[PDB]
């Protein structure tokens, strides 16, 4: 979800938004900023949480060799769905 600034300046996922007083905004008129509308924060948020009944789940991320190293995910935290640092896919432990 891209957000706009008061001067109509759409913000990027990093949060950069040049204010009106910034002289560095003059390259922006007559032209445009390229904004990755697919904000990386919310195309992972809508992804569901898979249910695997094990204490440690591999996280290859699909594609076999095409993915991220198979860092093993610890699954015993009931209050925290264990997510992978590489791909961010949240993994869960069946509700006992």
């Amino acid at each position: 979800g891209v957000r706009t600034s008061p001067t109509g300046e759409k913000v990027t996922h990093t949060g950069q938004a040049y204010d009106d007083g910034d002289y560095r905004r003059v390259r922006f008129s007559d032209r445009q900023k390229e904004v990755n509308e697919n904000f990386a924060i919310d195309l992972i948020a809508e992804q569901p949480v898979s249910e695997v009944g094990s204490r440690v789940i591999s996280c290859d991320g699909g594609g076999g060799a095409l993915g991220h190293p198979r860092v093993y995910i610890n699954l015993d935290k009931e209050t925290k769905t264990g997510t992978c640092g590489y791909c961010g896919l949240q993994f869960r432990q069946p509700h006992h």
Partner: protein, 48 residues
Amino acid sequence: PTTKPPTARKYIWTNHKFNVSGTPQQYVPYSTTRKKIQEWVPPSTPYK
């Protein structure tokens, strides 16, 4: 592609752009980082 459609994904562009240079749709370099040295925002009203 008529005999082999590319792997359909959500983030893929639904419409392939040309070389946008020359047109007002050009690209302009700009810092994508955030400023990390904020000022003191001096408070107002009284005098020493």
